[PDB]
Amino acid sequence: NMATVPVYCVCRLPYDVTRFMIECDACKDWFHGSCVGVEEEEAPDIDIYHCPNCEKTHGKSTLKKKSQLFIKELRSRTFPSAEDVVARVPGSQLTLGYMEEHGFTEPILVPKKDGLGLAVPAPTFYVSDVENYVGPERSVDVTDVTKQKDCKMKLKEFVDYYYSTNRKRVLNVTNLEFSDTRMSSFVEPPDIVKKLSWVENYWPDDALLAKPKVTKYCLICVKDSYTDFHIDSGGASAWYHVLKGEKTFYLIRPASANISLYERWRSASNHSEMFFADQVDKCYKCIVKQGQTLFIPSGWIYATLTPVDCLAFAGHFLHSLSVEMQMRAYEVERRLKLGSLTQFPNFETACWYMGKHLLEAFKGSHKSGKQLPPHLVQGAKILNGAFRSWTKKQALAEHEDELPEHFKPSQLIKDLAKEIRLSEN
Amino acid sequence: PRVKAAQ
Ligand SMILES: [Zn+2]
Ligand SMILES: [Zn+2]
């Protein structure tokens, strides 16, 4: 049952993970080191490499170039397995009805992509292909794992680091939204995510403000890298799919004590020198392998450990099953006032659109003679209270920018309050 | 020169 795959080098063979290869700078093709007489030891001495076919016209090769203990402190601990809390659900059985029955309060791991409606490239898709479709000149946010700092650089400069032997630095790319690139057509979020997303359902097509550019993330994590504990912006639930390699997740339940500890920990200037898992009771260790998809609920504090080179796709979304938790995380995020790099764009704008939808649902409930489910009523009250805080005379200037066009908050707040009171009998 | 190591 054959299929078609790319081939490389003069021998025109598929990629071999056990064979050292070097890419010609002219034809952009990879050649086996043994095939072209290049040994892996002598590879760093080369500046520009040209294969013999390219050397005929483009000239000869320029063969003249002129936190580890912290990772050991992660497996030093004996964390409980995720099987106690993380459920294993087939993609076909992870439907909208399943979410309503269980409430999406614990992470869900789907071992097989089948049934999820997830569209991802074939496993023969490499970081070299990521550069071509995202754009080699596109600027990306690269995280220095050892220094725990961020810096901007060209994508071609990072991929040069990725495809270099004996990496001196530990650099990761975890904030790369490619929905505006050619690679966006290759990735489609799981169908359950699109069903549950507030933006996918309630964001108007003619809205002047742009939709939250959080739908398609690409992650390139190098071997023996680490990402610290964090909460996704706005309490957005997330989905992670590992195309190649594997990832280890360290999940902490968003309990009231744990959320408070995270806020105080993240606010501290020396939060990178403090291991956050010390202060929490239970920190579940979950291993997401190749081809597996992990769904993280709202407000969960998670960190990742990468034992091998890993290419993964992720996305953030908001749903109606964790309205209270999403607001609480957003309030914590606002108080922290951290860097607006991994933030959730137009989080309040989505809430205003959600509030408008809830008011229409309340009108529909009156017409149809069937009141809304209790969680929608509670979420409406939570959102309605936030609307008053955002549009208060002493706080409107902060939240006016995210207010949608042709929106009169005073009418919306008054209508929601009356509908909630009417639907509370 | 971009390279791919062995395993
Ligand atoms: Zn060549
Ligand atoms: Zn070859």
Side-chain angles (χ1 to χ4, degrees), chain A residues 8-11 13 19 21 30-36:
Chain A
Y8 304 99
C9 186
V10 293
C11 45
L13 292 183
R19 301 183 59 181
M21 305 188 69
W30 301 80
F31 300 88
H32 293 117
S34 53
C35 286
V36 297

Side-chain angles (χ1 to χ4, degrees), chain A residues 141-146 148 150-151 153-165 167 169-336 339 342 344-365:
Chain A
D141 296 316
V142 172
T143 301
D144 193 331
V145 180
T146 49
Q148 293 299 331
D150 292 357
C151 61
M153 55 192 288
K154 298 250 190 63
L155 181 60
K156 59 178 174 59
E157 195 187 352
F158 173 82
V159 73
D160 286 4
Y161 156 82
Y162 182 87
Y163 286 117
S164 66
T165 178
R167 306 166 182 167
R169 299 168 298 177
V170 192
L171 304 176
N172 281 21
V173 170
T174 59
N175 181 19
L176 173 58
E177 217 287 338
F178 60 93
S179 63
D180 56 334
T181 71
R182 309 158 57 195
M183 205 176 67
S184 179
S185 53
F186 297 159
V187 180
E188 195 69 23
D191 290 358
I192 187 61
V193 173
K194 284 181 289 185
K195 289 184 177 182
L196 292 167
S197 178
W198 282 0
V199 180
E200 189 78 5
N201 295 276
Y202 310 133
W203 197 287
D205 305 327
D206 61 325
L208 302 183
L209 291 170
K211 294 191 177 183
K213 195 174 181 295
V214 294
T215 56
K216 299 173 184 179
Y217 286 102
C218 178
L219 306 93
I220 308 175
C221 302
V222 298
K223 175 175 176 296
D224 300 323
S225 65
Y226 172 79
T227 292
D228 213 331
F229 292 93
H230 65 289
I231 296 185
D232 290 321
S233 179
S237 300
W239 60 270
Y240 286 77
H241 181 76
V242 178
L243 180 55
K244 295 186 62 178
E246 71 182 25
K247 194 101 63 177
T248 301
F249 282 73
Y250 293 89
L251 304 150
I252 303 175
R253 198 176 67 86
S256 180
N258 295 328
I259 292 179
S260 295
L261 290 182
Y262 169 80
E263 182 179 10
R264 305 158 96 89
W265 166 82
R266 189 62 174 85
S267 64
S269 59
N270 64 321
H271 70 276
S272 297
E273 289 91 351
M274 302 185 299
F275 189 50
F276 178 67
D278 300 350
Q279 311 162 25
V280 300
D281 182 17
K282 301 177 184 178
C283 175
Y284 303 98
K285 177 182 179 180
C286 178
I287 300 179
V288 181
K289 298 188 182 63
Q290 178 179 355
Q292 302 177 339
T293 308
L294 177 64
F295 299 86
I296 301 180
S298 177
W300 281 72
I301 317 170
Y302 64 94
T304 62
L305 172 62
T306 323
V308 299
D309 287 1
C310 182
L311 179 63
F313 299 99
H316 300 336
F317 64 98
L318 301 175
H319 55 80
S320 304
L321 303 184
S322 299
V323 181
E324 177 183 346
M325 184 61 63
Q326 286 171 169
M327 286 304 305
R328 180 181 295 102
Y330 181 71
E331 294 166 359
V332 174
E333 176 185 352
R334 288 293 297 179
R335 290 192 292 268
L336 288 184
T342 60
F344 193 99
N346 294 96
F347 170 85
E348 307 176 13
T349 308
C351 295
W352 287 108
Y353 284 138
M354 179 55 181
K356 176 183 177 181
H357 165 68
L358 288 175
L359 180 57
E360 299 179 1
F362 272 131
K363 299 182 178 181
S365 61

Side-chain angles (χ1 to χ4, degrees), chain A residues 23-29 31 49-52 54-55 58:
Chain A
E23 183 187 31
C24 178
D25 193 65
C27 61
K28 294 299 182 301
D29 190 8
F31 300 88
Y49 178 78
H50 282 173
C51 65
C54 283
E55 284 194 13
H58 300 297

